[PDB]
Structure formats: structure tokens, C-alpha cells
Design a protein around this nucleic acid. Structure first.
Length: 149
RNA sequence: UCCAAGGUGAACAGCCUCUAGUUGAUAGAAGAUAAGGGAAGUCGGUCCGUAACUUCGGGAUAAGGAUUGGCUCUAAGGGUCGGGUAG
């Protein structure tokens, strides 16, 4: 069908709003076959061509799992995180973080926020600055390259 | 019943010596080989000449007499400072 409305688990309204504002006009086969299972107690091994909605295909289930496991609540502890994302290069991880930020643009207010932090090797921030703002801001998503993470 | 040196042997062994003990035992004099035959007998016969190898650590980074510079991505690689022309 490739329609967002007739998916198995009825995606969250703000994720749907973000998708509609971004568009895509539909859901790709990768996003149609991965999102229902990656949020449904199944590990996922996905091979797909470049630029086929893969990034959103693994970003939407991440946010769904974050909301599902009550990660965006006062009960969540300090110095803890929920989800990790790893990429082999710094630019790819920064691009993934930009996609996540674009999705979280339409996150509603009046609720405990969901944030992300990028951990890449940079000359503008030591690892101790990363630890300091991780403690202060308390994100639930970490995105970075293997060395700095 | 206790203690127990060294060197050769380079096969327990045997041989020689260091420390330590002996000179004790009546005294003096004056098995091996074989020519020829070969059981005819009797009851009974380790060291000289080659070649490859070969021990311990530390080392990382393709080498180690030469002109050393040596892959892609990926935490850190001592600290600090410093940017023009005009009003």
C-alpha cells in the first residue's frame, strides 16, 4: 500500500506531522518493511540502495522506542542514555544528527523534551566538554563515530 | 641409626685427590707367551671435511647501509599567542 495511515502500529501524531511537513509523499519499501519490525522486538539487517529513505527508516523507530519505553519522562535517570547511533565518518554522523533534529523540530512542548548529542572527534570540544553538557542537557539519543563515542 | 668435597669418566661403575685419619699385621737372608699342524686329546672341546639451522628480552607499524619520506576511515597527540585598508 505504501501509506502511512495503514501501518501496523499507528505512528505517533508528532512523528506523522514531521513526516507530512517533510513530505516524501509516501513511505518507501525500506521504511515500509523496516519500521514495523525494528519497533516490534526484532533486530534488523537492512541492505538497500543509496538515498532510499534509510535514514528515516532507522530514525522513526528510534523515536518510537524512546517514547514507548518512557525515556522522555522525569523517571529517567541522569548520566544515562537510551539509543546509540554509529557511523564510520564524522560527516555522516553529523548528517544523521541533522535528520534527527529535523524530525524533532515538530516535537510538542509542555512535555519532557527529547534531545540528541553528537560525539565526533573535534578540535573545538574535548571529551570532558562532551561529558559536561551530556550531564547538563540529559539527552536520550547519542550519535557519533566509533573513536569519540 | 645420623652427616657426606672436587675432578675424570663424558655409560650406575671404576680411577685420582682436598679436609680428616692411618703406616696396623714377628723380622732378616736366600697368569702370560710360543714355529708347523688345528680336537689328531678325552667317555664326552666417541673421533677428521661439509652445510643449513639454532637462545633470551625489547620492540608494533614495509625495509634496516641507504636518497626514509610509507595507505583509507576512526578518541587524545604539551601550553599559549598572533590577521588587512579607510573614516
Amino acid at each position: 500500500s505504501l501509506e502511512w495511515d495503514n501501518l501496523g502500529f499507528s505512528l505517533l501524531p508528532w512523528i506523522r506531522t514531521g513526516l507530512d511537513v517533510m513530505g516524501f509523499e509516501t513511505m518507501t519499501p525500506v521504511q515500509a518493511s523496516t519500521i514495523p519490525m525494528l519497533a516490534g522486538n526484532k533486530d534488523v539487517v537492512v541492505d538497500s540502495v543509496t538515498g532510499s529513505g534509510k535514514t528515516a527508516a532507522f530514525v522513526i523507530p528510534v523515536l518510537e522506542k524512546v517514547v514507548k519505553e518512557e525515556a522522555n519522562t522525569s523517571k529517567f535517570k541522569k548520566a544515562h542514555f537510551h539509543s546509540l547511533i554509529i557511523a564510520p565518518t564524522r560527516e555522516l554522523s553529523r548528517q544523521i544528527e541533522s535528520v534527527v533534529l529535523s524530525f524533532l523540530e515538530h516535537y510538542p512542548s509542555d512535555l519532557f523534551p527529547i534531545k540528541c548529542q553528537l560525539l565526533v572527534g573535534t578540535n573545538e570540544a574535548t571529551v570532558r566538554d562532551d561529558v559536561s553538557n551530556f550531564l547538563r542537557n540529559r539527552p536520550q539519543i547519542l550519535i557519533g563515530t566509533p573513536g569519540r563515542v
